[PDB]
Design a protein around this ligand. Structure first.
Ligand SMILES: *[C@@H]1O[C@H](CO)[C@@H](O)[C@H](O)[C@H]1NC(C)=O
Ligand SMILES: *[C@@H]1O[C@H](CO)[C@@H](O)[C@H](O)[C@H]1NC(C)=O
Ligand SMILES: *[C@@H]1O[C@H](CO)[C@@H](O)[C@H](O)[C@H]1NC(C)=O
Ligand SMILES: *[C@@H]1O[C@H](CO)[C@@H](O)[C@H](O)[C@H]1NC(C)=O
Ligand SMILES: *[C@@H]1O[C@H](CO)[C@@H](O)[C@H](O)[C@H]1NC(C)=O
Lengths: 430, 137, 139, 49, 48
């Protein structure tokens, strides 16, 4: 009988930090005698750097595919000026828009995206600022100093955060002003009513409660923005990516302190207490041990990008089948009743905002799946039921109770009187 | 007399002859990323996370007349032309930056990478007389 | 040790091929042998047909699209409300005003045609964001 | 060395199981609990339920 | 002109048996001298 509009979040990982490791400086950083024994494994170290290159190339291709899907066939006006109006149909979309155009600075993220990057330190800009504060200054206690000097460094991606944040903004303003390149016409106030009607709600109620729908979207976005001052499932998955990458780099760094059966772990101590003839047996145990740890990291990193690339394919589909064009698929974008979906930038992935149709009240009525008329004819409802009000047959929707007269625009005709249809030789339509 | 961390590395000591305390820090050992064209004569160097006035004074002694600070580090043999944007590059250096070597100062350049854009239309977003203005093929 | 490293790369390489081959099978069953209502799936927006050909180590797809050539600006309306608090909205098109009369046009081609029952939808409410037109009753 | 070969093999087969399970979830939501308009997805073209 | 209804069946794998391996039960069963040579490798078994 009554209905409201709900909303929920969703995070899909589409990126991963790019790590570049060189086996030359990892095992034979500066010692000359180390290179004489590593030359026999020359092909072994060449393959390690070769696999790490093709892994980072896959993250570069997937990053361009996401940016291409966000602005695939989008048309905006040259006089848009998304800094004065910022509203449509009395709906506040200011928290989802940053700055569009070259008339701004280096930061153009929306207010909602600022709540996600202020809680993640090791972001795209975090690694750049961290590595800068090692070759100069004081209080060098960060762990990234040692990893960078030993041959473990993280490279920035091709597209920056500002560029990707500017692509999600263009996709949001697309379905707000003409020519509405994100909905093929059907403006935003009308696009919502068309999809709610598809669930089984008559349009006589939607045109009378336009203020209730407008205030529902404003309340839903306000609860999502205020929900970040807590521990939700969205922030838990984002922080799990930057924490799993730190543990993998610190575990590989501790491999330089192991002995693997040798007398010590430092190559300077071995080359200072043993003669050259009996020193190759101790260095060979360190080379054969450190190279094994590299293969364990390369094989694990390759098995991890496959799950990220597979998950990135689902994010591209939701941009094309849930954001830029609503698909007739059911139980794909959200959970049953689905209306719209919006995309925002997130650290190492994207954030989705799904809106749903949630009823509040209910009532019990008697319905019929179809009645046979006089003349061996029959009728069947179309997304609805047949009710009996005041000794007369009416029509109501499957998602909203509103009796309407039976017509030919919402009833499927049939030329056969079934045995399990209620008889009613009083209703005339033709 | 020695200071260690959880991982087991020495990060300080104390001298028993002068009663002074110090702090040991790892010395720089990095790697240079250079981009080279097809039939050029010298590639463009880029020291990541290394500001200028430190490479040409402490680790490098080669006379380099072209150098400037960038968002990624100190770039050698290049010109600052970040205002120019190009949607196609084969030398990608970082977060939205390209070189875009030009056919023959330094021949290499340093521009911004903008691969995707939007199609603008000279229409009005505000309604006039209750109607909307769009383009129909 | 070199053989263990080579066989480990085969398990990771074929895993990516299985993901790519799964999309090719779905594309054959939904783009060439059948037309599915999935926008931005078989092509870049306006997709009409699709053909498949044999290629070395994979398959080759041929996608046909719909590319406009010329454009023309025109004032359109998202819908109008008739007399008696009744409403009417277009489907896959817009409403245009030509020679002091309301007509119908497509959303992908400019061709004015008279309004009919098979080109619009019928409602029972008169929203405040539409335009009034009592001169048209069944035109 | 034998344990590394077993662990590295599990990281490769877990992706095939997780990828196949994603197709099962999509089939329940589009072929069992709902009738999707997709053709040649739930059956051989003449699929009913 | 005439028709009938046919039935088919298919199987899609979803889960896999969970396997757990111990540190001091596969390399060194119960011998203390064996554990001394394993401690120098660091956290090699902990990563497994
Ligand atoms: C639905 O709920 C709203 C909010 O409480 C209320 O204003 C409205 O009267 C309700 N409508 C019906 C039909 O109960
Ligand atoms: C250092 O301090 C200790 C204790 O105060 C003192 O005994 C010693 O003589 C000092 N060393 C020098 C070189 O003065
Ligand atoms: C490079 O040029 C841009 C714009 O021309 C300017 O903002 C920037 O400060 C310049 N950088 C240097 C190091 O001169
Ligand atoms: C609908 O009309 C109201 C009344 O002035 C106005 O405030 C609102 O902006 C209009 N909506 C659209 C989408 O034009
Ligand atoms: C179709 O086949 C069934 C089974 O033999 C038979 O009972 C039925 O009469 C047939 N119908 C027609 C129209 O041939």
């Amino acid at each position: 009988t009554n209905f409201t509009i709900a909303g929920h979040e969703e995070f899909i990982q589409t990126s991963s930090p790019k790590v570049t490791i060189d086996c030359s400086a990892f095992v034979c950083s500066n010692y000359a005698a180390c290179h004489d024994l590593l030359s026999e494994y020359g092909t072994f170290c060449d393959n390690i750097n070769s696999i790490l290159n093709e892994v980072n190339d896959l993250l570069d291709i997937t990053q361009l595919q996401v940016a291409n899907a966000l602005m695939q066939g989008v048309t905006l006006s040259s006089n848009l000026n998304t800094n004065l109006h910022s509203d449509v149909d009395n709906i506040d979309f200011k928290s989802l828009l940053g700055c569009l155009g070259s008339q701004c600075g280096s930061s153009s993220r929306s207010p909602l995206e600022d709540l996600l990057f202020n809680k993640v330190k090791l972001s795209d800009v975090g690694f750049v600022e961290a590595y800068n504060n090692c070759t100069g200054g004081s209080e060098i206690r960060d762990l990234l100093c040692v990893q960078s000097f030993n041959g473990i460094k993280v490279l920035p991606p091709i597209l920056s955060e500002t560029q990707i944040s500017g692509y999600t903004t263009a996709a949001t303003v697309a379905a707000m002003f003409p020519p509405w390149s994100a909905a093929a016409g059907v403006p935003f106030p009308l696009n919502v009513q068309y999809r709610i009607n598809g669930l089984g709600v008559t349009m006589d109620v939607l045109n009378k409660n336009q203020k209730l729908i407008a205030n529902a979207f404003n309340k839903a976005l306000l609860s999502i923005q205020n929900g970040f001052t807590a521990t939700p499932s969205a922030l838990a998955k984002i922080q799990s990516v930057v924490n799993a990458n730190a543990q993998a780099l610190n575990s590989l760094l501790q491999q330089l302190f192991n002995k693997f059966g040798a007398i010590s772990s430092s190559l300077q101590e071995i080359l200072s207490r043993l003669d050259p003839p009996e020193a190759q047996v101790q260095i060979d145990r360190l080379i054969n041990g450190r190279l094994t740890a590299l293969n364990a990291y390369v094989s694990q990193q390759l098995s991890d990008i496959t799950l990220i690339k597979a998950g990135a394919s689902r994010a591209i589909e939701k941009v094309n089948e849930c954001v830029k064009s609503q698909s007739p698929r059911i139980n794909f974008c959200g959970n049953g009743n689905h209306i719209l979906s919006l995309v925002q930038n997130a650290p190492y992935g994207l954030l989705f905002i799904h809106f749903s149709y949630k009823p509040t009240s209910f009532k019990t009525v008697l319905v019929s799946p179809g009645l046979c008329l006089s003349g061996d004819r029959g009728i069947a409802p179309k997304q609805g039921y047949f009710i009996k009000q005041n000794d007369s047959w009416m029509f109501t929707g499957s998602s909203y109770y509103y009796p309407e007269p039976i017509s030919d625009k919402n009833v499927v005709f049939m030329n056969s009187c079934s045995v399990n249809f209620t008889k009613a030789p009083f209703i005339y339509l033709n | 007399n020695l200071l260690y961390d959880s991982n087991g590395n020495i990060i300080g000591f104390k001298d028993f002859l002068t009663n002074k305390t110090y702090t040991i820090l790892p010395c720089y050992s990095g790697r240079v990323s250079a981009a080279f064209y097809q039939n050029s004569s010298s590639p463009a160097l880029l020291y990541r996370n290394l500001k200028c006035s430190y490479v040409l004074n402490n680790i490098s002694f080669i006379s380099q007349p072209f150098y400037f600070d960038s968002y990624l580090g100190c770039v050698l043999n290049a010109v600052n032309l970040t205002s120019y944007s190009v949607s196609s590059c084969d030398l990608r250096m970082g977060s939205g930056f390209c070189i875009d070597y030009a056919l023959p100062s330094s021949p290499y350049r340093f521009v911004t990478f903008e691969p995707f854009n939007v199609s603008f239309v000279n229409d009005s977003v505000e309604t006039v007389g209750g109607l909307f203005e769009i383009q129909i093929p």
